[PDB]
Symmetry: C3
Subunit: 258 residues, 3 copies
């Protein structure tokens, strides 16, 4: 399959196309809004938190460009027994075996989610040890999930990588729910943290669910539905999450200064 | 050549399959042990050393799964003049030109090795400059080793990359043997450091040798033995190494405190 | 299109081959020269700058080896509307459609440019916030540049990434020209920083110009000429830039010794 065919496949499919191009527009508009909102920051620690946050939609716009252009999408055949094995996709007038694997999402999450975690950790006044733990295991979760999506030799290996990824995820969840909830009180950011933490935990839990229900998993959701589900999660987990963090940050630059 | 053909290819050859699936379980079992061993730590600095150390077997289980699943393995045709050139593999009933390239190892080494170094550097009370130097050259060592294995155009190029990788390695060896060995004194970990240090250097020194002997080098060793050589080296350079460091840490948390 | 075909295409193409092999040599000689020059450094901060600087030619030799070997080169077909669409390369013995894409340059810039910036920011006495910002957007610039060259589906998509990459570039430019220019005055390195600042801004502006003029862009410059333009830029932006920064550092260790 050609990159252009996958690019044409995205266009031609209103559902799939809208899920991608809307976030290219939204992520781009977010970057511009966030830069305008924080233009007045003077404190370097507050600025560090703002840059880290702004990088979230910066990575997002590139991720969606990679997906919509076909650069980071592949057509893969599922292993023996996989709920979607034997499926076909059809590019233009031709029909090919396999499923539309949008691995570009999983790959870029390894870049954007560490930035969400770094911004949140700093906001909560975390120490280096916890930031390092959250971030490394977070990256490990994103990479093993990518590996699971790219494995086509065995149906079991796929879910095994999915398990490894879930294990790394509980670590991140633990420091978010336990560790940082405490740190935030000592930092004077318990209020905004509890909000972002609640949002983060609930929205993030959605990704592995969507993964299991879409073509990658048990395939009960079509490609266009699974994509909008992720694009919807991103809109909250990234764009509104960042708007709320930066909205607070610009009104509380002094508290975050340290 | 599909991923499916490489997966089962690991089978039908218990010599190769064992070296892989065995470390998957040893890595996982090591992770469990370490987590319960370090349940007592409370010092943020001692906690850093532990997490850094625990990540080694974490990257290892994923690395072996990538290899075992056929995800990070390929069949490459060696260049003219290469000893393994003109070889076949046959992923089943059909035989194809090339050799079984397990690049999956070299790729993850750029992730695991930096963590081993992070742990050691912290133990010795190293400063940032030395940590930065060790980790950057260690990563360069791994990536060029990976490039060496993927180069199929020229035999001399493969060896040129090998040479570059060796130059980066001496940089790591130098900080281990000369720099940190001295920092460990001011940190008060010279004792445990010398131990881990001696272990690390001897074990790492074997990876390039294995590479040179395996199918990607002179090809005197079979993919099964080379895989076991590495698999054996990891058990020491990673798991047992992690245990020694962690064992010390749990018993001497106040030594590496400074928090 | 095999790696070998690419490796042989470079050879038998004097322009292209010379733009690659010459810098494998210049990078290597630069590494030796810089190590020799910095031998007497003792302050940890002074040595951080030096190591960060030396890593520039280390990444560079590996980059050029990757290109000369054919490992990081590919033949791609340009999208409709591209002034290089439907082009032929005549690779090996048979004419092949597409353009020789040396994407290995963009891939390694993501590793080398952050080191140039770390060295400069340190030289200017930058806080961690500006260093984080400069380096992350620099990496974003490089990765989206690589994505642009790797995009064959749409012509518009290629220039859009180029646009995103440019946006990231202005952040780096602003930090160099606005932020660090003022910081260097407090760090007592105003003179040398302003010099390296300018050399850097001028040479870096050269890369997107070459990208746009070369085969990746409007194609007014054939592959061998686009390659020499990049190789000429690297000699100034990397090797002589590093030579000048180290020349200053070794005569002013105390000025940047700080902590
Ligand atoms: C808006 C935007 C993109 C919009 C896209 C749109 C609308 C696409 C529409 C597509 C359509 C309709 C498609 C239709 C299809 C076919 C249609 C057809 C006609 C063909 O048929 C169909 C029908 C579905 O099939 C991008 C912005 C993109 C924006 C970018 C790339 C911005 C970059 C900014 C940066 C990078 C600033 C950074 C600033 C910083 C880091 C500032 C720093 C300060 C701190 C500085 C310090 C510390 C260094 O001193 C701070 C205080 C934090 O601000
Ligand atoms: C146990 C495990 C895996 C076990 C696997 C086994 C037994 C596999 C067996 C396979 C077989 C027999 C195959 C046979 C083949 C048949 C093949 C065929 C296809 C036919 O079937 C045949 C026959 C040869 O051919 C994994 C764990 C995997 C575990 C993972 C991925 C864990 C992640 C979590 C961590 C590492 C927590 C970390 C917690 C930390 C760092 C907590 C923090 C504390 C500090 C707190 C702070 C910093 C947050 O404040 C600290 C003190 C550091 O602990
Ligand atoms: C010189 C060199 C290479 C030269 C290559 C040449 C000339 C190639 C020529 C090719 C030709 C002509 C080809 C022709 C083709 C065919 C021709 C034919 C005839 C065959 O037909 C044709 C015609 C085009 O088609 C490499 C060096 C290569 C060098 C390397 C790889 C060096 C590594 C060193 C390190 C990594 C040290 C590092 C030291 C450090 C970091 C020291 C640290 C100090 C601080 C210490 C601390 C922090 C640890 O405490 C410090 C102060 C920073 O120095
Ligand atoms: C973050 C995102 C948004 C930015 C984009 C970067 C990266 C994800 C793009 C890599 C894309 C490829 C895997 C795409 C496959 C396209 C196929 C359907 C077509 C193959 O047909 C093309 C062949 C011709 O020979 O070229 C064969 C060569 C082709 C061109 C593949 C070359 C692949 C190399 C091995 C991959 C490089 C990837 C980078 C190391 C990734 C991340 C780096 C970090 C620092 C951000
Ligand atoms: C890290 C360890 C512990 C876990 C391992 C996970 C991961 C690193 C493995 C990725 C595997 C692939 C490179 C395997 C290629 C196998 C080929 C022989 C078959 C390709 O057939 C698939 C084609 C169909 O077109 O898809 C074309 C797309 C194919 C699948 C290539 C996709 C390549 C992307 C661009 C590479 C992503 C790698 C990450 C950048 C590595 C590290 C990232 C850091 C920031 C954590
Ligand atoms: C560190 C600095 C100093 C040194 C820089 C050196 C750099 C130039 C080398 C990196 C080179 C690789 C990206 C090359 C891949 C070449 C491919 C286009 C063609 C492979 O041809 C083989 C096919 C056969 O089918 O397998 C198709 C599948 C193949 C085998 C997959 C290869 C996948 C690789 C392992 C993907 C990981 C790439 C790393 C994330 C890149 C940079 C990492 C940073 C953190 C150092
Ligand atoms: C901007 C993107 C965000 C916030 C992405 C978040 C992604 C996750 C929390 C993904 C988790 C997964 C698992 C826990 C199991 C395996 C599969 C994944 C990758 C979907
Ligand atoms: C867990 C894995 C470990 C500790 C791996 C260590 C690997 C090395 C020290 C590899 C070194 C190599 C060279 C010095 C030369 C070229 C080839 C390599 C990659 C095998
Ligand atoms: C050693 C390499 C150096 C100094 C490389 C510098 C590269 C740039 C400044 C590249 C910038 C680019 C853009 C701003 C737009 C898109 C294309 C690029 C990647 C050429
Ligand atoms: Cl600042
Ligand atoms: Cl993303
Ligand atoms: Cl802690
Ligand atoms: Cl590993
Ligand atoms: Cl030092
Ligand atoms: Cl480079």
């Amino acid at each position: 399959v050609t990159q252009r065919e996958l690019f044409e496949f995205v266009l031609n499919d209103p559902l799939l196309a809208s899920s991608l191009y809307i976030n290219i527009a939204l992520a781009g508009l977010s970057i511009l809004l966030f830069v305008f909102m924080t233009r007045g920051l003077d404190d370097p620690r507050a600025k560090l938190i703002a840059v880290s946050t702004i990088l979230v939609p910066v990575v997002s716009i590139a991720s969606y460009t990679g997906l919509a252009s076909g650069l980071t999408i592949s057509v893969l055949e599922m292993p023996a027994g996989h709920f979607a094995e034997g499926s076909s996709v059809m590019l233009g007038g031709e029909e090919v075996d396999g499923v539309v694997t949008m691995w570009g999402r999983y790959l870029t999450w390894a870049l954007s989610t560490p930035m969400i975690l770094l911004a949140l950790g700093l906001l909560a006044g975390s120490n280096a040890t916890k930031l390092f733990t959250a971030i490394t295991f977070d990256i490990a979760m994103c990479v093993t999930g990518l590996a699971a999506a790219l494995t086509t030799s065995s149906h079991l290996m796929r879910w095994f990588w999915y398990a490894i990824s879930c294990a790394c995820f509980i670590v991140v969840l633990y420091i978010l729910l336990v560790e940082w909830a405490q740190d935030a009180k000592a930092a004077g950011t318990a209020d905004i943290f509890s909000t972002l933490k609640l949002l983060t935990v609930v929205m993030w839990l959605g990704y592995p669910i969507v993964w299991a229900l879409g073509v990658e998993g048990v395939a009960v959701l079509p490609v266009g539905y699974t994509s909008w589900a992720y694009s919807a999660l991103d809109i909250v987990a990234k764009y509104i999450f960042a708007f709320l963090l930066l909205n607070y940050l610009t009104s509380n630059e002094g508290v975050v200064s340290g």
